[model samples]
Target: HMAVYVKFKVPEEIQKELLDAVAKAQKIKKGANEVTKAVERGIAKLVIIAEDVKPEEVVAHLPYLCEEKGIPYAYVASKQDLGKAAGLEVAASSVAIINEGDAEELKVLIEKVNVLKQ
Candidate 1:
């Protein structure tokens, strides 16, 4: 995560929901590894990377990894806002949302994000 980046204020409940399905969504740098594991296990549904943060640093190679894993990825406009929404004091590089495989809401959210990214 960079020092200066836009921040978004996502709902706290939204953040909470992210935490459960996500093995690691910008929580700790270490979570990147966890994300890989989850993806390999076919547990990850969507991945949200920080748009403002450089992917070459904290999450270098993560984008490619997500692609290879057949997982959806997107960029939110701010890192600071992401941290705040994720209930953190610092910036984050990436975040993962779990895929329930049976939840229409999650599916709709993922589809919406895909359209937005395009």
Candidate 2:
């Protein structure tokens, strides 16, 4: 298992808001590969990771990377739900919000996440 430094669950209401933001986001990255790229590039505003991923190492680096880049992130319970929220047929280990589109929910979510980190 990999180290989990910043692990927390997104509240149900906030999870819904996040999914809505993702659905409306103009620039979002799905899956671990793209999410890592987005985080490393410093373009990701928020990252959503799945808690139930196999091997754990698959997404173990994400929270640390997000922390290094000063990006906010939260973990949801299921990859299946996350994939569907991102409009995909398959599961996604992670999702990054690059552009929030018209939704202001990202800021609210970020604030909550930041509070949790403290």
Best by lDDT: 2
Which stretches of model 2 miss by more than 4 angstroms? 1-6
Worst 10 residues of 2 by lDDT: 1-10
Error of 2 at 100 (Å): 0.8
Cα lDDT tens digits, model 2, 7-77, are 76566777777777778889889999999999998899889988788878889899889888888888776
Clash count, one per candidate: 4, 0
RMSD of each: 6.7, 2.4
Clashing pairs in model 2, backbone N/Cα/C closer than 3 A: none
TM agreement with the true structure for every prediction: 0.58, 0.88
Local error of candidate 2 at residue 8 (angstroms): 2.2
Question: Best TM-score goes to which candidate?
Answer: 2
Quote the RMSD, in angstroms, for model 2.
Answer: 2.4
